[PDB]
Design a protein around this ligand. Structure first.
Ligand SMILES: *[C@@H]1O[C@H](CO)[C@H](O)[C@H](O[C@@H]2O[C@H](CO)[C@@H](O[C@@H]3O[C@H](CS(=O)(=O)O)[C@H](O)[C@H](O[C@H]4O[C@H](CO[C@H]5O[C@H](CO)[C@@H](O)[C@H](O)[C@@H]5O)[C@@H](O)[C@H](O)[C@@H]4O)[C@H]3O[C@H]3O[C@H]([C@@H](O)CO)[C@H](O)[C@H](O)[C@H]3O)[C@H](O)[C@H]2O)[C@H]1O
Ligand SMILES: *[C@@H]1O[C@H](CO)[C@H](O)[C@H](O[C@@H]2O[C@H](CO)[C@@H](O[C@@H]3O[C@H](CS(=O)(=O)O)[C@H](O)[C@H](O[C@H]4O[C@H](CO)[C@@H](O)[C@H](O)[C@@H]4O)[C@H]3O[C@H]3O[C@H]([C@@H](O)CO)[C@H](O)[C@H](O)[C@H]3O)[C@H](O)[C@H]2O)[C@H]1O
Ligand SMILES: *[C@@H]1O[C@H](CO)[C@H](O)[C@H](O[C@@H]2O[C@H](CO)[C@@H](O[C@@H]3O[C@H](CS(=O)(=O)O)[C@H](O)[C@H](O[C@H]4O[C@H](CO)[C@@H](O)[C@H](O)[C@@H]4O)[C@H]3O[C@H]3O[C@H]([C@@H](O)CO)[C@H](O)[C@H](O)[C@H]3O)[C@H](O)[C@H]2O)[C@H]1O
Lengths: 58, 57
């Protein structure tokens, strides 16, 4: 009967959907750390600087 | 300039370019880097060749 064949494919459908879910989570986690670090590094880059007061010679 | 005695009638013989990476950048290999220059209807394409000896380094 059709009942047996339906159950077999059902298991396969669940496993496939889990794979595509894993890709999206892993990619978002990788891009999270890069975007956070870039923001913090740029903030330090703009604000920081050195200034010359006076120059003397002998 | 190529003339020391009188730099007025001289021309540029050497050019130096200071290069750094951008903030939060992945490493760059300079052997795969190409340099383009345009001057007086001449388009140049310069390339570095890596070597153990007799290398411009
Ligand atoms: C950097 O920039 C500078 C300035 O812009 C130059 O362009 C230089 O290029 C060099 O120029 C010199 C001088 O032109 C060249 O040396 C010369 O080589 C010649 C060889 S060649 O004939 O085959 O081409 C000659 O041997 C040159 O000698 C000449 O000049 C003698 C002096 O002339 C003066 O005479 C009276 C004063 O007494 C004055 O009224 C004049 O106005 C004139 O200045 C002369 O006796 C010779 O008969 C002949 O014509 C030679 O120049 C030599 O002298 C000069 C300097 O005294 C001139 O004022 C200088 O020291 C040179 O070092 C010297 O050899 C050289 O080839 C170029 O590279 C750029 O590098
Ligand atoms: C582009 O145009 C330039 C015009 O400004 C120039 O023509 C360039 O050509 C270069 O010419 C210079 C000479 O002006 C040469 O430099 C000298 O090279 C020798 C090499 S050697 O094999 O012949 O021995 C040497 O490295 C000389 O350095 C000496 O002097 C320094 C500083 O005093 C010191 O560390 C050592 O004592 C060393 O022996 C160098 O000549 C330089 O020094 C002199 C005097 O101080 C010497 O008493 C002048 O100040 C000179 O301007 C200096 O360059 C280059 O070989 C050549 O590429 C052209 O590319
Ligand atoms: C540009 O981007 C590239 C990716 O697209 C790559 O990342 C480049 O980096 C290069 O990577 C290759 C590895 O594939 C390496 O080159 C190899 O270097 C060693 C020598 S070692 O001293 O670095 O350990 C290896 O022996 C090969 O060198 C041979 O060939 C050169 C001529 O180019 C010669 O001067 C040497 O004496 C030596 O014979 C070289 O690998 C290349 O050659 C092989 C075979 O022919 C070997 O028999 C393959 O054809 C391969 O595709 C070649 O890469 C370097 O680490 C680095 O330059 C980056 O520049």
């Amino acid at each position: 009967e059709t009942g047996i064949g339906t159950l077999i494919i059902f298991i396969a459908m669940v496993l496939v959907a889990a794979v595509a879910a894993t890709v999206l989570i892993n990619t978002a986690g990788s891009l999270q750390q890069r975007a956070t670090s870039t923001g913090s590094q740029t903030t330090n880059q703009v604000s920081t600087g050195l200034i010359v007061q006076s120059i003397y010679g002998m | 300039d190529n003339n020391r005695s009188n730099p007025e009638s001289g021309s540029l013989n050497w050019t130096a370019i200071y290069v750094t990476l951008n903030t939060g950048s992945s490493p760059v290999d300079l052997s795969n880097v190409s340099l383009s220059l345009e001057y007086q209807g001449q388009l140049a394409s310069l390339k570095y060749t890596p070597a153990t000896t007799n290398a411009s380094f």
